[PDB]
Every structure is written in structure tokens, then in C-alpha cells.
Amino acid sequence: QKHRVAPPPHVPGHLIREIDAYDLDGLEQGFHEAWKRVQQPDTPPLVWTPFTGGHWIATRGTLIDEIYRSPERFSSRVIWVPREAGEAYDMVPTKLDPPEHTPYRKAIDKGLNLAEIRKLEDQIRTIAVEIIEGFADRGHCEFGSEFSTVFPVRVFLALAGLPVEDATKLGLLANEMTRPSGNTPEEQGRSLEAANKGFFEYVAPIIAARRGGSGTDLITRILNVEIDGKPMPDDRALGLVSLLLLGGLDTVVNFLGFMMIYLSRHPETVAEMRREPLKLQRGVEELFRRFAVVSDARYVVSDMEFHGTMLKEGDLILLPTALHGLDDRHHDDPMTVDLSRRDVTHSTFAQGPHRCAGMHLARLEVTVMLQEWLARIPEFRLKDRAVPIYHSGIVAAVENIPLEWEPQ
Numbered sequence: 264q265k266h267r268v269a270p271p272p273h274v275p276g277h278l279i280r281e282i283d284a285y286d287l288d289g290l291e292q293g294f295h296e297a298w299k300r301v302q303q304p305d306t307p308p309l310v311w312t313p314f315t316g317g318h319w320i321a322t323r324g325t326l327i328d329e330i331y332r333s334p335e336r337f338s339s340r341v342i343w344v345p346r347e348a349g350e351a352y353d354m355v356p357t358k359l360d361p362p363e364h365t366p367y368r369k370a371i372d373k374g375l376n377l378a379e380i381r382k383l384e385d386q387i388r389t390i391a392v393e394i395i396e397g398f399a400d401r402g403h404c405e406f407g408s409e410f411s412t413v414f415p416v417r418v419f420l421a422l423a424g425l426p427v428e429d430a431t432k433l434g435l436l437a438n439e440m441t442r443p444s445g446n447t448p449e450e451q452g453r454s455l456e457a458a459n460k461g462f463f464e465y466v467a468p469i470i471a472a473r474r475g476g477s478g479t480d481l482i483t484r485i486l487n488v489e490i491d492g493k494p495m496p497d498d499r500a501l502g503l504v505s506l507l508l509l510g511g512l513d514t515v516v517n518f519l520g521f522m523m524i525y526l527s528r529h530p531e532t533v534a535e536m537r538r539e540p541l542k543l544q545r546g547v548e549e550l551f552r553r554f555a556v557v558s559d560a561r562y563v564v565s566d567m568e569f570h571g572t573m574l575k576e577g578d579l580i581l582l583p584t585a586l587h588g589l590d591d592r593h594h595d596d597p598m599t600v601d602l603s604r605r606d607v608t609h610s611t612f613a614q615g616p617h618r619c620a621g622m623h624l625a626r627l628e629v630t631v632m633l634q635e636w637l638a639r640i641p642e643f644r645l646k647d648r649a650v651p652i653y654h655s656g657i658v659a660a661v662e663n664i665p666l667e668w669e670p671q
């Protein structure tokens with residue numbers, strides 16, 4: 264049964280659209296496909312849904328890009344739907360606007376900048392090879408269980424200096440953060456609250472132990488960057504370390520599944536990447552355009568008109584990131600991966616001051632992944648009549664990806 268909220272007075276009937284971000288109409292065909300159904304040729308730039316507590320949805324890439332780049336009009340005070348979850352959310356620096364955001368982002372950047380992450384290339388590659396060699400000769404694997412959920416998790420826990428055995432409990436907290444359980448705004452609010460507290464509990468002893476440590480992992484590197492000449496307060500550290508873990512695990516895992524489902528159904532494009540290693544390297548950004556995973560929000564700072572639409576202070580606008588990279592007004596044949604596409608403009612990493620601080624790590628993990636996969640498993644397909652299973656929310660997920668090949 265579907266929970267509806269009545270539209271506020273300022274939302275006119277003709278902008279109402281019944282869209283459930285947590286269970287999209289047509290989701291069984293795919294996350295990307297289901298979002299694309301929302302973006303019809305004449306659909307308004309901003310539509311309002313009575314589901315998930317009532318919120319706007321931006322339906323075109325340029326509104327998405329514009330909103331992300333404008334913190335003074337669209338604040339990060341709430342970035343989750345429903346509002347209750349968004350209000351419970353406590354991660355740093357995603358909850359913050361400039362200028363409070365900016366020293367925390369600087370601290371993160373000491374650990375995650377491109378020069379730093381380039382150093383991690385070989386560790387990443389060793390992890391990739393080891394996993395892949397575990398099944399390359401077998402001629403089949405379940406990609407999700409045996410690769411996508413393993414690789415990025417192992418990479419990050421190693422980088423963060425954390426025991427691999429923590430993967431499960433962290434994954435479950437991640438799921439309740441990004442796809443909270445509940446069929447009502449309040450239930451979802453409560454699921455998020457609980458997962459968030461879970462992350463704070465996990466993270467406090469590491470913070471306590473690693474302050475002034477030690478200690479060369481990602482966590483101690485970032486934690487020990489000063490904020491206005493003194494140590495990071497506890498409240499901020501908990502949100503910051505939790506966000507590192509949340510971004511480090513869930514996103515890449517799921518990106519990988521979407522990407523690999525497409526590749527297994529497109530041998531010609533796999534073969535291009537094989538024949539031309541530079542097409543692969545340069546084509547990774549095209550994959551990020553094509554397999555966005557985040558759909559998150561902003562808070563309308565003041566009453567305003569925006570793209571011909573009346574907005575009220577406190578309105579939430581969901582930004583389905585897939586609707587930028589896949590916008591047919593931004594890219595011709597947007598559903599096709601074209602490794603040679605010159606314009607790959609997307610918001611898979613968002614825009615503005617919050618543009619993904621992990622983007623260099625994400626790009627490197629995917630490029631190493633493809634290089635070592637293709638080196639050992641040059642050809643592959645999705646099992647005959649297999650049906651991947653799809654989940655939507657703030658971060659998209661997929662499951663059940665049986666690949667098959669002829670061992671080389």
C-alpha cells in the first residue's frame with residue numbers, strides 16, 4: 264500500500280507526478296531504464312510527487328547541474344528524502360554549506376586528492392588480480408557475490424586500515440543509510456537514524472585511537488588535519504569518518520554491477536576496450552556518465568521561481584543523477600556506451616563544492632578493474648535468461664549477475 268501526502272497550496276495539479284524513488288515504476292527492467300521513463304519528451308523540468316513525504320524531482324540534466332552548483336539557493340541542510348531521514352542524517356561534510364563545509368572538504372582532500380590516490384594503484388591492482396584469479400579459469404561466476412561486493416570493499420578497508428571482517432556489518436549499515444526500510448516517511452526516518460548511529464558507534468573507538476596517532480592509513484591522515492588551528496571536534500569527526508566509510512563501500516560496488524551488466528550484453532564494446540587499451544582508459548568517464556547511482560536532494564533556501572516553477576522555502580528537490588548523464592538533450596543516444604564520445608558531461612559525481620571527493624579513487628578502481636578483468640577474461644556474457652534484480656533509493660543497487668565465458 265502506497266503512502267501519499269497532499270500537495271501544498273503552491274504545487275499546481277499539472278506538475279504532480281506519481282514517482283516513488285524507493286521503488287520506481289518499471290524498476291524490474293533496470294534502475295537507469297526506470298528513471299528514464301520519468302524523462303519523457305514533454306515532461307516539466309520540475310515535477311512533484313506525493314510519495315516519500317512529498318518532494319520535487321528535477322527531470323533534466325541542466326537543473327541537476329545548476330542546483331548542485333548553487334549552495335546559496337539550494338542548501339545541504341537536508342539531502343535525503345523523506346524529510347525525516349534527511350533530518351536524521353548526520354555525515355560530514357555533506358550536511359554542511361560553504362563556508363563551514365570548506366575546511367572539512369580540505370581535510371578530506373589531503374587523503375583523497377589525485378596525487379595521493381595514484382599511489383594506491385598497485386595495491387588496488389593486486390587486490391583485483393587475486394580476486395579475479397579465483398575464478399577466471401572456471402568459465403562462470405556470480406559477478407555481484409564474487410566480485411563487485413568484494414573488490415571495492417577490500418580496497419577501501421585496506422586503505423582505511425580496517426579489518427576485512429568488518430565488511431558485513433558496514434554493508435548492512437550502508438544499506439539502511441541509502442535504502443532505508445519502511446513504507447512510511449517516519450519508518451524510513453527511524454531506519455536511517457538507527458543505521459547512522461550504528462556508523463557513529465563503529466567509528467568512535469577508531470577516532471579515539473587514531474587522534475594524534477600514529478599511523479598512516481586514510482583515517483588517521485584525514486582526522487589529524489586541523490580545523491581553524493585546532494583538532495577536529497568529536498561531533499564532526501564521527502560524521503566525517505562515517506561518510507568516508509559510506510562513500511568508500513556502497514557506491515563503487517553498485518556502479519560496477521550496472522556497468523558489467525551492460526558490458527556482458529555488448530561484446531563489440533568489450534572488444535574495442537581489448538583492441539585499444541587507450542580507449543578503455545579514456546572511456547572510463549563515459550562509463551560514469553552512463554551508470555549514475557546517486558539520487559539525493561537539496562533544501563530550497565528561500566521562496567523563489569526556478570525554471571518557471573514556484574518553490575517554497577524548505578521544499579526538497581530530488582536530483583536523480585542518472586537524469587543528467589542520460590538526458591537526451593545532453594547526449595545523443597544516451598543509453599549507448601560510446602567510448603569515443605567527446606562530451607561526457609554528467610553529474611554522477613554531482614557538481615559544486617560537494618562534487619565527489621572520492622572521484623579519483625572511483626575512477627582508478629574502475630580502470631584497474633577493467634584492465635585486470637579483460638586481461639584474464641577477455642570475453643563474457645550474461646547467463647541465458649538471467650534476470651538481475653534491482654533496487655532504487657538514494658543509492659541504486661543490483662544483484663544477481665551470472666557471467667559465463669570460455670576460459671582462455
Ligand code: HEM
Nearest residue numbers: 356357368510511514515518557612613617619620621625
Ligand atoms: C561510483 C562511485 C561514486 C559515486 C557515483 C559517488 C557519488 C558522490 C556524490 C553524488 C556526491 C555528492 C553528494 C552530495 O553532496 O549531495 C559524493 C560526495 C562524496 N563522496 Fe563520492 N561517490 C563515489 C565514490 C566515492 C568514493 C570511493 C569515496 C571514498 C571515500 C567517496 C567519497 C565521497 C565523499 C567524502 C563525499 C563528500 C564530498 C563533500 O561533501 O565535499 N565517493 N559522492
